[PDB]
Amino acid sequence: LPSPILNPDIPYNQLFINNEWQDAVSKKTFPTVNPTTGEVIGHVAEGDRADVDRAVKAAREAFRLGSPWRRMDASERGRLLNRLADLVERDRVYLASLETLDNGKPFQESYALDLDEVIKVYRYFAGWADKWHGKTIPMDGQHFCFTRHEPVGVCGQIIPWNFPLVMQGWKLAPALATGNTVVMKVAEQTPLSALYLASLIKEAGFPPGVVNIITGYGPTAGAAIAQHMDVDKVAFTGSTEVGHLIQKAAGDSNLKRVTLELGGKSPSIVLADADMEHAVEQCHEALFFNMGQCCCAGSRTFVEESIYNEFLERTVEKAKQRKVGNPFELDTQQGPQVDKEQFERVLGYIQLGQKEGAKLLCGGERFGERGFFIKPTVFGGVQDDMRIAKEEIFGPVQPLFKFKKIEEVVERANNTRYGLAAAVFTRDLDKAMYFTQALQAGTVWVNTYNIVTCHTPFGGFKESGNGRELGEDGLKAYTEVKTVTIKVPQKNS
Amino acid sequence: LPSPILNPDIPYNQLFINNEWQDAVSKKTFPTVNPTTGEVIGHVAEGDRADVDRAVKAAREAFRLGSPWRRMDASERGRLLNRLADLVERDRVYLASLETLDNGKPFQESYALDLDEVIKVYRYFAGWADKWHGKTIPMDGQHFCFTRHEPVGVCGQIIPWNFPLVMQGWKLAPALATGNTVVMKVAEQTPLSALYLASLIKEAGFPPGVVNIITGYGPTAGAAIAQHMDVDKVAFTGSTEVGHLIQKAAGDSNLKRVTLELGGKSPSIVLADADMEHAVEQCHEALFFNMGQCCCAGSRTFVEESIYNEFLERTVEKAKQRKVGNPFELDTQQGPQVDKEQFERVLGYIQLGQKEGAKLLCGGERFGERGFFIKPTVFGGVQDDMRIAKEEIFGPVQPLFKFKKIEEVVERANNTRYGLAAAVFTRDLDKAMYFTQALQAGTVWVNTYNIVTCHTPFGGFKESGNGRELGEDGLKAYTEVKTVTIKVPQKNS
Ligand SMILES: NC(=O)c1ccc[n+]([C@@H]2O[C@H](COP(=O)([O-])OP(=O)(O)OC[C@H]3O[C@@H](n4cnc5c(N)ncnc54)[C@H](O)[C@@H]3O)[C@@H](O)[C@H]2O)c1
Ligand SMILES: NC(=O)c1ccc[n+]([C@@H]2O[C@H](COP(=O)([O-])OP(=O)(O)OC[C@H]3O[C@@H](n4cnc5c(N)ncnc54)[C@H](O)[C@@H]3O)[C@@H](O)[C@H]2O)c1
Ligand code: NA
Ligand code: NA
């Protein structure tokens, strides 16, 4: 429970390439907003294709066979990720404040949850660096066979705005541990935190060009990376629609390797025998956590028929109770949406729900006068055909669904292009074990929600993604396997 | 070595869909050519889009929750794969003959190598079915976390003509072991053997819809699969060219998962201290194996200056020695190319080589005047910038190169958009060890070539592929990871 720095010095507002700060070729900039006040915080360098080209050559050089970064011990790569984490913890109050400033999330979140997960991912993967093993293989014939786990190479990385430092860690930590080099494009919203961190990557002792950071727009800077002919791998976190473009740009350019971490319409499923007050609290937090701007948010609450009215009333009361206000004041649970578009976009979805036949139970309008705050909104009587039931709202709007049968709710939960996450609330063993098989999602929770750490693999089924991030499974994306098969004189077991 | 069946009965020439032989919806057929004579062996059904929809419907139903395929034991999936190995070994002669008839490969190859690799690959992945383990994870908090290794779902599988039975087995064996269903598109040049196999899949007792076979054209039948909106994964083996289209098609459809096994221009590299006779014999077979129609063929023989003349002379002699002729004769080493289009494409490359100032050393024209035979061809004094140095010939054309230093040959070997395979020939330990780190290839041989068994992962660096086939690493493509995270009352080590 420390004290936030209410308005700090922001020395870093340029591109980070080859371990030095410099402007865009064109010298352009663009504004970043504070969503609570609505006012422009400051200007940041606007990257484009020429700037990317620079970063890729820097990255490519740091990955040259013989390079400091390539020659170095895998354990030294770990120690660097560990130093980096020491530094993040030293500047924790600055970083958690700068995150709240630029993104709008509560400072209790930023500090306690976000920055903690940033420290642990760098520390977790640090440990993985010298533990990632290839195989020796007792193959047929007079042969000694083994696999090498080499890095994939220059890894392009594109992240969204909703967890700016977390999402950065999810990308950098594993790529660096497996020995790769990185050209990262951060969101156009929320660019400031990631630049301060880049300073600590330099201070930690990472060689020039191993990490390069680029502020700028998606259609320009981002698509330059996804289309570059000398980028070995792209890793994209963002919307399902842009995901489709990224995989096309890979196939259109150089057949670079692709991981996609995309959207969700993740169901929260509450059975009869569930702990009532525990389900209402978790399903509430499932949705409204990070103001609904969370990829796997519980944006479709399905509740068993016999407990629906009780569940409804409590869920609304929890939303009415939810403290909306300035995120720097500790005890604020809900900050503002991240920018003007998202604010208007969510408000449009609220209107749309009403127009289709859903009952607005509470909130459903702007909170206050300044900034991009919205009153916690809950809908009832919601049907599967409705647009709010099908589309990723990405804001503080909780639609409630009724169901009768177990076989019914699994069909309805899965009936979507999404498949990032899901959950069951139940006291029953057998029913818990059925839902873990039946639900088409990459992460299934039982009697909890939004539990994701550096150990837990995370990614989507179907149009929610390709591949997985975090855990041991998250290293595979940043690994290119070489098979080495050597003729030998005689072979013995 | 047994007698071949010269005039086998060919009962199977239709689509295989839901364990039923059926004509295409259009009733259209198309002919397959014996490349040894040039005559039409017979007609097979010309599948198109409407026929792929029907196949994918069947594969989807077979994959439903509660279907026989899904709730079967993993060890029964193994026994099915083993039973099929037995049936293949029962009909080994028939199948190796039908392969020769349709592909043109020597009957010695078809029986002793191809059909042995097919039996071994089905028996190998039979073993993996019930040994493919997920994780239990010591995760932060009051949680029990584990991973399930689920099948990825409906897998679209597209294969080339050069090793029909083997390419099918590399696809079906791991896919089935991990519990997927399959829609397979086999090459138009060689549709017959793959259909007789489907007859044994039925006889082995696989459920209906689990394996489906479509004969038909690439831009029609193959594109129908790759673009299909209910196919979960596409595994494509073919040209780099078509590879770009498959990865684009995925991004353009439903974000299906993509493994690509693509072309090569793999270098064999001979050092001064190598066993000459052996290095000559191996580099010779590296290229001329399967009439040069091999993805990872040693199609750039690099040789150290001090042994070059002696190497050249011996290589040329070997080329002139290689018995060309009818593949059904036991001592034939080189059959015809697969069809007229491939036959002419290679003679184009032979002409093109000499136009660029490459020295022709032997062969260089048709062999005889019936079927699609070409003379073992070898090219002296070849330079990096020539089209025959850069492009995949896919025929019995062995260009020789010359080098002085190691750092030189590593540069020159790696300077290509390909990276499927490579080899080095040397007696020295440090050198062998250096080349295994330096060469940018998914497979690196030492004092041998074309050693690929079920045990050994196989796939490309750069534009030669995305992901890996065979070995344990071969199972990852056919696996969708689900993370389960359960709230527990308390957590102890
Ligand atoms: N699964 C996960 O790990 C995860 C985590 C957080 C958010 N998300 C998802 O991300 C979305 C929210 O972020 P968003 O709206 O800013 O997504 P977005 O697709 O609009 O942009 C994300 C990033 O990609 C860039 N980009 C945009 N268009 C591009 C293009 N044509 N080519 C290359 N790059 C481009 C942006 O500049 C930004 O850096 C939601 O749909 C959410 O569910 C997923
Ligand atoms: N790396 C490996 O595992 C491996 C093994 C053997 C062969 N190969 C490669 O395969 C190639 C030779 O086979 P090929 O000549 O039939 O190549 P190809 O690209 O023309 O076609 C391969 C398969 O895809 C189909 N196809 C063609 N165009 C298509 C399209 N637009 N959409 C969907 N499917 C399409 C064909 O019908 C065929 O079944 C060579 O490049 C060789 O190196 C690779
Ligand atoms: Na902002
Ligand atoms: Na044929």
Sign of the dihedral defined by the CA atoms of residues B356, B357, B358, B362, in that order? positive
| Chain B interface disruption, residue of A434, A473, A485, most B CBs within 10 A | A485
In the reported structure, the alpha carbon of residue B470 is separated from the centroid of ligand 2 by a whole-number distance in angstroms of 18
What is the DSSP code string of B153-185?
-EEEEE--SSSHHHHHHHHHHHHHHTT-EEEEE
Of B147, B246, B451, the CB nearest to A143: B451
Sign of the dihedral defined by the CA atoms of residues A103, A105, A108, A112, in that order? negative
Structure tokens at B412: 């020159």
Report the C-alpha gap between A114 and A135 in whole angstroms: 36
C-alpha to C-alpha distances, A263 to A40, B159, B230, nearest whole angstrom: 28, 33, 19
Nearest atom in ligand 1 to A261's CA? 1
A353 carries a ligand binding annotation: no
Cβ atoms of residues B269 and B409 within 8 Å: yes
Please indicate, yes or no, whether residues B36 and B125 belong to a single structural domain of this protein.
Answer: yes
Ligand 1, pocket residues at CB < 6 Å? A 158-162, 185, 187-188, 217-219, 222-223, 226, 237-239, 242, 245, 261-264, 295, 392, 394, 420
Name every chain B residue with its beta carbon within 8 A of the beta carbon of A426: none
B255 and A466 within 8 Å at the Cβ level: the answer is yes
Please indicate, yes or no, whether residues A257 and A270 belong to a single structural domain of this protein.
Answer: no
Which residue's structure tokens are 């070994």?
A: B89
Please indicate, yes or no, whether residues B378 and B310 belong to a single structural domain of this protein.
Answer: yes
Q: What CATH number is given to the structural domain containing A277?
A: 3.40.309.10
A137 in helix, strand or coil?
A: strand
Nearest to A432 by CA among A419, A442, A447: A447
Q: What CATH number is given to the structural domain containing A243?
A: 3.40.605.10
A481 and B468 within 8 Å at the Cβ level: the answer is yes
Please indicate, yes or no, whether residues B224 and B294 belong to a single structural domain of this protein.
Answer: no
Q: Is residue A308 part of a domain?
A: yes
Cβ atoms of residues A301 and A389 within 8 Å: no
A436 and B484 within 8 Å at the Cβ level: the answer is yes
The DSSP 8-state label assigned to residue B216 in this structure reads B
A432 and B137 within 8 Å at the Cβ level: the answer is no
CA closest to B422 among chain A residues? A484
CA closest to A66 among chain B residues? B438
Q: Is residue B6 part of a domain?
A: no
Of A453, A457, A485, the CB nearest to B456: A485
Nearest to B99 by CA among B36, B21, B17, B38: B36
Ligand 1 binding pocket mutation candidate from A171, A184, A242, A473 (most atoms within 8 A of CB)? A242
Q: What are the φ/ψ torsions at residue B96 (nearest 5 degrees)?
A: -65, -30
Please indicate, yes or no, whether residues B300 and B420 belong to a single structural domain of this protein.
Answer: yes
| B417-449 as b/e: b if 16+ CB within 10 A | ebbbbbbbbbeeeebbebbbebbbbbbbbbbbb
* Structural Rg of chain B based on CA atoms: 23
* Structural Rg of chain A based on CA atoms: 23
Please indicate, yes or no, whether residues A325 and A437 belong to a single structural domain of this protein.
Answer: yes
Report the C-alpha gap between B131 and B119 in whole angstroms: 20
The residues of A that are catalytic are 261, 295
Please indicate, yes or no, whether residues A278 and A251 belong to a single structural domain of this protein.
Answer: no
Of B248, B468, B483, the CB nearest to A248: B248
Please indicate, yes or no, whether residues B302 and B283 belong to a single structural domain of this protein.
Answer: yes
Chain B interface includes A274 (CB < 8 A): no
In the reported structure, the alpha carbon of residue A236 is separated from the centroid of ligand 1 by a whole-number distance in angstroms of 7
Cβ atoms of residues B267 and B298 within 8 Å: yes
Q: Is residue A454 part of a domain?
A: no
Q: Which residues does residue B423 pair with via DSSP β-bridges, in sequence order?
A: B268, B445
B441 and A482 within 8 Å at the Cβ level: the answer is yes
Contacts of B437 (CB under 8 A, 6+ apart): A65, A148
Q: Is residue B115 part of a domain?
A: yes
Rounded to the nearest angstrom, the minimum Cα separation between A27 and chain B is: 34
Q: Is residue A158 part of a domain?
A: yes
Report the C-alpha gap between A224 and A360 in whole angstroms: 43
Name every chain A residue with its beta carbon within 8 A of the beta carbon of B444: 482-485
Packing angle of the helix pair A74-90, A115-128 (nearest 10 deg): 170
The residues of B that are catalytic are 261, 295
Of A137, A251, A254, the CB nearest to B248: A251
What stretch of H or E contains B29?
Answer: strand B29-33
Name every chain B residue with its beta carbon within 8 A of the beta carbon of A65: 437-438
The DSSP 8-state label assigned to residue B199 in this structure reads H
Name every chain A residue with its beta carbon within 8 A of the beta carbon of B138: 455
Packing angle of the helix pair A92-103, A164-177 (nearest 10 deg): 120
Contacts of B338 (CB under 8 A, 6+ apart): B35, B103, B104, B161, B162, B189, B190, B293, B372
Name the strands in the sheet holding A397-403, side by side, starting at the edge strand that comes first in the sequence: A359-362, A377-380, A397-403, A300-304, A267-270, A421-425, A443-446, B479-487, B143-151, B136-137
B247 and A250 within 8 Å at the Cβ level: the answer is yes
Greatest CA separation for chain A: 82
**Cα dihedral angle (B55, B60, B66, B71), rounded to 10 degrees?**
70
Structure tokens at A120: 């642990």
Which residue's structure tokens are 């992460």?
A: A443
B445 and A486 within 8 Å at the Cβ level: the answer is yes
Cβ atoms of residues B353 and B359 within 8 Å: no
C-alpha to C-alpha distances, A393 to A253, A260, A337, A399, nearest whole angstrom: 33, 20, 12, 10
Please indicate, yes or no, whether residues A291 and A249 belong to a single structural domain of this protein.
Answer: no
Pairing of the two strands A421-425 and B465-466: unpaired
Please indicate, yes or no, whether residues A228 and A310 belong to a single structural domain of this protein.
Answer: no
Q: Is residue A295 part of a domain?
A: yes
Report the C-alpha gap between A474 and B51 in whole angstroms: 38
| Chain B interface disruption, residue of A481, A488, A491, most B CBs within 10 A | A481
Domain count, chain B: 2
* Residue with CA at minimum distance from ligand 1 atom 15: A239
Rounded to the nearest angstrom, the minimum Cα separation between A10 and chain B is: 34
Q: What are the φ/ψ torsions at residue A399 (nearest 5 degrees)?
A: -90, 135
Name every chain B residue with its beta carbon within 8 A of the beta carbon of A243: 255
Please indicate, yes or no, whether residues A300 and A239 belong to a single structural domain of this protein.
Answer: no
Q: Is residue B158 part of a domain?
A: yes
Cβ atoms of residues A386 and A358 within 8 Å: yes
Q: Which of residues 55-114 of A touch B (CB under 8 A)?
A: 65
Q: Which domain holds residue B39?
A: 15-263+465-481
Report the C-alpha gap between B280 and B285 in whole angstroms: 9
Q: Which amino acid is at A428?
A: D
Return the number of CB contacts < 8 Å for A and B: 192
- Residue B410 half-sphere exposure toward CB, CA atoms < 13 A: 13
Q: Is residue A4 part of a domain?
A: no
B485 and A443 within 8 Å at the Cβ level: the answer is yes
Nearest atom in ligand 1 to A241's CA? 19
What stretch of H or E contains B432?
Answer: helix B429-438
Distance of CA B396 to the CA centre of its chain: 18
Please indicate, yes or no, whether residues A400 and A441 belong to a single structural domain of this protein.
Answer: yes
